[PDB]
Design brief:
The protein has 80 residues and is of the alpha+beta class. Helices cover 15% and strands 32% of the residues. The structure holds calcium ion. Interacts with rfp1 and smc5.
C-alpha cells in the first residue's frame, strides 16, 4: 500500500557447505548484516569472504537489501 510500514522480507539462503536457512529480515539491513545474521542463526563464524549470490550475481555487502532487486520469497546462495 501507499505509505506502508512493512519491514521484513522472507529469504531462503541455500548453502552447499552449511545449513540452509529461511530468514525474515529487515529490508534496511545490509547484505553484510544478512550474512552476519545467517551466521549467528546457523552458528558458523562470520568472515569477510562469505558472499551471497543472487541469480548468478554477487550481492554487494554494503548495499541495503531494499537497494538490491531482492523481493519477498526470493532465494540466494551462500558461498563460503
Ligand atoms: Ca545446505
Amino acid at each position: 500500500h501507499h505509505h506502508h510500514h512493512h519491514k521484513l522480507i522472507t529469504l531462503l539462503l541455500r548453502s552447499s557447505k552449511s545449513e540452509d536457512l529461511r530468514l525474515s529480515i529487515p529490508v534496511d539491513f545490509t547484505v553484510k548484516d544478512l550474512i552476519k545474521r545467517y551466521c549467528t542463526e546457523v552458528k558458523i563464524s562470520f568472515h569477510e569472504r562469505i558472499r551471497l549470490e543472487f541469480e548468478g550475481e554477487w550481492l554487494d555487502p554494503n548495499d541495503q537489501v531494499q537497494s538490491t532487486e531482492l523481493e519477498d520469497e526470493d532465494q540466494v546462495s551462500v558461498v563460503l
